[PDB]
Amino acid sequence: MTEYKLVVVGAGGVGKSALTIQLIQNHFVDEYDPTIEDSYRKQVVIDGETCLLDILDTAGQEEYSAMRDQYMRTGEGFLCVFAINNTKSFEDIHQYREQIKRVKDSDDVPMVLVGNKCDLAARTVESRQAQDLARSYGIPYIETSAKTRQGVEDAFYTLVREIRQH
Ligand SMILES: Nc1nc2c(ncn2[C@@H]2O[C@H](COP(=O)(O)OP(=O)(O)NP(=O)(O)O)[C@@H](O)[C@H]2O)c(=O)[nH]1
Ligand SMILES: [Ca+2]
Ligand SMILES: [Ca+2]
Ligand SMILES: [Mg+2]
């Protein structure tokens, strides 16, 4: 049994908590309670390997973000989340990527770009734009919905598969 330390980052309200809770607890959180710093742990079998996921759900709200960098340091792979109906959250990804590079002191950190809320039709970030951003970082882009479960396993398990490539 291997442990994978995953960290979920991104702007306030994009659905980091809802994603993590859908993965771990199999329900959708409809309300919006801003996070400070929460952790989740679960044993899961991923590609035939029994492993322990330790997931750090981080704050996106500036007001709640004290010491996020000290949490982020510990991470082995990052889910960089934006919402497909929130163009500013997508623009913000560059700054999260810069933060991750600064806390890991590496240009080569396991990451997945996640476009969440794909159940919603008020899309302002087209798939291709995010594909392009992810291509520039040499990482995958995956769309998710914490509400329907679309892509949610695939996002987190892809991040583990990325960690295994480094
Ligand atoms: N339709 C839809 N709503 C979503 C989805 N994911 C999250 N939401 C909603 O968006 C709001 C914010 O979600 P939440 O998970 O709290 O966002 P967050 O990124 O963790 N916010 P913070 O950074 O403040 O902790 C909630 O009302 C939640 O139900 C999704 O995939 N689809
Ligand atoms: Ca609910
Ligand atoms: Ca550093
Ligand atoms: Mg949250």
Numbering used by the authors: 1 to 166
Please give sentences taken from the publication describing this entry.
We solved a new crystal structure of H-RasWT·GppNHp at a resolution of 1.56 Å by using a crystal with a space group R32, which was grown under a condition distinct from those reported previously. This structure corresponded to state 2 as judged from the presence of the hydrogen-bonding interactions between Thr35 in Switch I and the γ-phosphate of GppNHp. In State 2* and State 1WT, Tyr32 was found to exhibit alternative conformations presumably attributed to its flexibility. In State 2*, Tyr32 adopted two distinct conformations, (a) and (b), as shown in Figs 3B,D and 4A. The side chain of the conformation (a) formed a water-mediated interaction with the γ-phosphate of GppNHp as observed with Tyr32 in State 2 while that of the conformation (b) formed a direct hydrogen bond with the γ-phosphate. In contrast, State 2* possessed WAT175, which established a full bunch of the interactions with Thr35, Gln61 and the γ-phosphate as observed in State 2. In the other alternative conformation adopting the conformation (b), hereafter representing State 2* in this paper, WAT189 was missing and the Tyr32 side chain showed a shift in its orientation and established a direct hydrogen bond with the γ-phosphate oxygen atom. In State 2*, the side chain of Gln61 seemed to acquire more conformational flexibility due to the loss of the WAT189-mediated hydrogen bond with the side chain of Tyr32 compared to that in State 2 although its position was not so much different. Moreover, the positions of the Tyr96 and Gln99 side chains in State 2* were almost indistinguishable from those in State 1WT and appeared ready to accept and stabilize the Gln61 side chain at its position in State 1WT when the conformational change of the Gln61 side chain has occurred during the state 2 to state 1 transition.
Ras function as guanine nucleotide-dependent molecular switches regulating cell growth, development and apoptosis by cycling between GTP-bound active and GDP-bound inactive forms (Ras·GTP and Ras·GDP, respectively). Ras·GTP binds directly with the effectors such as Raf kinases through its flexible binding interface consisting of Switch I (residues 32–38) and Switch II (residues 60–75), leading to activation of the downstream signal. 31P NMR analyses revealed that in solution H-Ras in complex with a non-hydrolyzable GTP analogue, guanosine 5′-(β, γ-imido) triphosphate (GppNHp), exists in dynamic equilibrium between at least two distinct conformational states, called state 1 and state 2, which are characterized by different chemical shift values of the nucleotide phosphorus atoms, especially that of the γ-phosphate group6.
